[PDB]
Design an enzyme around this catalytic site. Structure first.
Site, short mmCIF file in Angstrom:
data_model
loop_
_atom_site.label_atom_id
_atom_site.label_comp_id
_atom_site.label_asym_id
_atom_site.label_seq_id
_atom_site.Cartn_x
_atom_site.Cartn_y
_atom_site.Cartn_z
N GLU A 1 0.84 -1.19 0.00
CA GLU A 1 0.00 0.00 0.00
C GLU A 1 0.88 1.25 0.00
O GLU A 1 0.51 2.26 -0.61
CB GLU A 1 -0.93 0.04 1.21
CG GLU A 1 -1.81 1.28 1.24
CD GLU A 1 -2.51 1.51 2.58
OE1 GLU A 1 -1.88 1.29 3.64
OE2 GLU A 1 -3.68 1.94 2.58
N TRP B 1 -8.61 -1.07 -0.14
CA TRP B 1 -9.41 0.01 -0.72
C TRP B 1 -10.62 -0.39 -1.58
O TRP B 1 -11.44 0.47 -1.93
CB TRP B 1 -8.49 0.96 -1.50
CG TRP B 1 -7.49 1.65 -0.62
CD1 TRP B 1 -6.22 1.25 -0.33
CD2 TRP B 1 -7.69 2.88 0.10
NE1 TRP B 1 -5.62 2.14 0.51
CE2 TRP B 1 -6.50 3.15 0.79
CE3 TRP B 1 -8.76 3.77 0.21
CZ2 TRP B 1 -6.34 4.28 1.60
CZ3 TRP B 1 -8.61 4.90 1.01
CH2 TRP B 1 -7.40 5.14 1.70
N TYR C 1 -4.31 9.22 -0.86
CA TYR C 1 -2.96 9.71 -0.52
C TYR C 1 -1.94 9.97 -1.63
O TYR C 1 -1.45 11.09 -1.76
CB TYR C 1 -2.32 8.86 0.58
CG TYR C 1 -3.10 8.91 1.87
CD1 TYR C 1 -3.15 10.08 2.64
CD2 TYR C 1 -3.86 7.81 2.30
CE1 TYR C 1 -3.94 10.16 3.78
CE2 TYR C 1 -4.65 7.89 3.44
CZ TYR C 1 -4.69 9.07 4.18
OH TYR C 1 -5.48 9.16 5.30
N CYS D 1 -7.28 10.68 7.28
CA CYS D 1 -7.08 10.55 8.73
C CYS D 1 -5.69 11.03 9.05
O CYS D 1 -5.46 11.69 10.08
CB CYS D 1 -7.19 9.09 9.17
SG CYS D 1 -8.83 8.49 9.41
N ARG E 1 -5.83 12.74 12.86
CA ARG E 1 -7.00 13.38 13.46
C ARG E 1 -8.01 12.42 14.07
O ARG E 1 -8.87 12.82 14.87
CB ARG E 1 -7.71 14.21 12.40
CG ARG E 1 -8.08 13.42 11.15
CD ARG E 1 -9.03 14.20 10.24
NE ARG E 1 -9.71 13.32 9.29
CZ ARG E 1 -10.76 12.56 9.60
NH1 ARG E 1 -11.26 12.59 10.83
NH2 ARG E 1 -11.32 11.78 8.68
N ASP F 1 -8.34 4.52 15.27
CA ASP F 1 -9.08 3.41 15.81
C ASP F 1 -7.93 2.57 16.33
O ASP F 1 -7.23 1.92 15.56
CB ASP F 1 -9.84 2.70 14.67
CG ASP F 1 -10.30 1.31 15.04
OD1 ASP F 1 -10.45 1.00 16.24
OD2 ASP F 1 -10.50 0.50 14.11
#
Ligand SMILES: O=c1ccn([C@H]2C[C@H](O)[C@@H](COP(=O)(O)O)O2)c(=O)[nH]1
Ligand SMILES: O=c1ccn([C@H]2C[C@H](O)[C@@H](COP(=O)(O)O)O2)c(=O)[nH]1
Lengths: 316, 316
Positions: free
Chosen positions: B60, B82, B146, B198, B218, B221
């Site tokens: 990734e 994804w 990204y 995130c 921000r 989990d």
């Protein structure tokens, strides 16, 4: 007391802070990565271990809050925090007919006469921005300063976004939003800026009915910057809460490169031998609620009783 | 051991984490503001207290590194991280002729038959993106993921900025720059996104000849996200150092809203009774240096020996 986290950062940097060369030509002792937090229910984090001018903080914040980019607003309230930036533009322009002024900041810090010439020219400039509306409009307008990034983010459609006003609405509708972020870092402009925003990005958070803010500063000058930086954002947090009818929570201050300019060592040390006093208390106008329409007299600092001020060289 | 900071965050959240309602429909225990750091000279921070698939991380990352926005690259390396996002687009489009699939994520988590129908449809989709170049081009391309924010920030001139490649150049010329920041947060697009990044923003720092990175997340989990998040950026830090001929320093992980979904409590607890083992060791290809041209076989994990995996529900 309340400000201990500050004092601990200073101590921290003095101990394991490594000497790193900086952009200016002074040296620095620095650490990379630091979180510090203040509980706003315990009082306002305005340092008592040295007199910090709350006015320069209060008027500069309202300035950003009004989406204002013109220095003229600051000067009317005797705030010269940004003069330096307007002036430099004025200096290297076709309309400037006067003393060389090249590298003025350094030259003034190094020559007695020059400094006096400088203050004569900068005195002239400040009068023109104040009275000549066209001059103010052409030289006092900074363009890309916080209040613009906050309240007028220019889009690729040439449009403009009110980041701040927008998030305040989400705070009132989706308090449990993990994306209440305002950013002042735009990749397209930053590579052509005298100083990219130090206060890169902040995030709000709401739980148990009380507001919190976390700021991310990529570069901080401990002795001179941080005392102002803390009060600015703690104050923002208060005003936003006031608007949203929320309670005040915590101000979390994260850092990237936190540094201490070596020409500040004696001053920080002397400060480190002072004993914090009871933090002051902030009072915002109960009747007024649109914080964008707030002005000086709607924000008050009670019981501020600090130690004398500590004068120290600005690094260049 | 190395991963203790993780385990301490989990313990931390279990203790004083307050119950806060979240976007999904599961509850959360959360804290706001947390810094955690890992010393990359001590080893790779890939958790040993549970088997984390390094492959999904490694492939990734290369994906982002190639400025790739098409899921097709992931699928060829059996990475379905994804898929969910491409698929949803495909579902609400004119070309979709099949089972309803509305709210598929929830419905599948709630119905046995449906889940099987879902995996049949998603199996179809994955085959089309893999073989139908036009389909891949119309449905596999995510657009704003990204690798796009990192390597093709679209400017107001319609142009495109290679944020990452740019900062890597500044790292090689101005290592002592306090503005080596890459941001993935664009105000104009974020209000129209299924999930704003995130991993909002990261900053590099160089001192004493060794590289450091600080990430600002921000929303995290803990049980499911963070173990992956840490390895991703620790790995980025390694590759960037490799390229810049620098030494590896520390990975600092700052957090905004760090949370634990209540349906993960037993799993985190069970993990919290495991004893960390010696962290694995990373090996990057010595001969290859352009990290943008790096592929799977140029990154290796040695001595990884974890505890069995802990299966747990994904929150919705
Ligand atoms: O509110 C502020 C504004 C600026 N600075 C300082 C940080 C650095 O000392 C300098 C910016 O340096 P660069 O990172 O741009 O190189 O200004 C502060 O500490 N506080
Ligand atoms: O690498 C990742 C990506 C996502 N998330 C999680 C954080 C939240 O659980 C959810 C995003 O929630 P919002 O903040 O958008 O509401 O996905 C992680 O923990 N790690």
């Amino acid at each position: 007391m309340l400000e201990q986290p500050y004092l601990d950062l200073a101590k921290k940097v003095l101990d394991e802070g490594h000497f790193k060369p900086d952009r200016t030509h002074t040296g620095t002792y620095s650490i990379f990565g630091h979180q510090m937090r203040f509980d706003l229910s315990k009082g306002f984090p305005l340092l008592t271990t040295k007199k910090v001018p709350f006015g320069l903080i209060k008027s500069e914040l309202l300035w950003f809050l009004h989406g204002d980019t013109n220095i003229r607003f600051l000067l009317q309230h005797r705030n010269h925090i940004w003069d330096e930036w307007a002036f430099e533009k004025w200096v290297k322009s076709d309309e400037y007919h006067g003393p060389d002024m090249t590298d003025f900041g350094h030259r003034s810090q190094k020559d007695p006469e020059f400094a006096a010439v400088y203050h004569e020219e900068m005195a002239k400039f400040d009068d023109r921005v104040l009275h000549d509306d066209a001059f103010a409009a052409k030289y006092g307008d900074l363009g890309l300063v916080y209040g613009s990034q906050w309240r007028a983010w220019h889009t690729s459609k040439g449009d403009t976004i009110d980041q701040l006003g927008d998030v305040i609405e989400q705070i009132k509708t989706h308090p449990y939003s993990r994306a209440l972020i305002v950013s002042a870092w735009n990749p397209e402009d930053v590579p052509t800026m005298a100083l990219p925003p130090c206060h890169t990005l902040y995030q709000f958070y709401v739980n148990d009915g009380k507001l919190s803010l976390q700021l991310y500063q990529r570069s901080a000058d401990i002795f001179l910057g941080v005392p102002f930086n803390i009060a600015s954002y703690a104050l923002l947090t208060h005003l936003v809460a006031h608007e949203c009818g929320l309670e005040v929570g915590e101000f979390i201050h994260t850092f990237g490169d936190a540094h201490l300019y070596v020409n500040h060592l004696d001053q920080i040390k002397e400060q480190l031998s002072r004993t914090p006093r009871p933090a002051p208390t902030l009072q915002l106008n109960p009747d007024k609620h649109d914080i964008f329409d707030f002005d000086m007299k709607d924000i008050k600092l009670l019981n501020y009783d600090p130690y004398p001020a500590i004068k120290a060289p600005v690094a260049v």
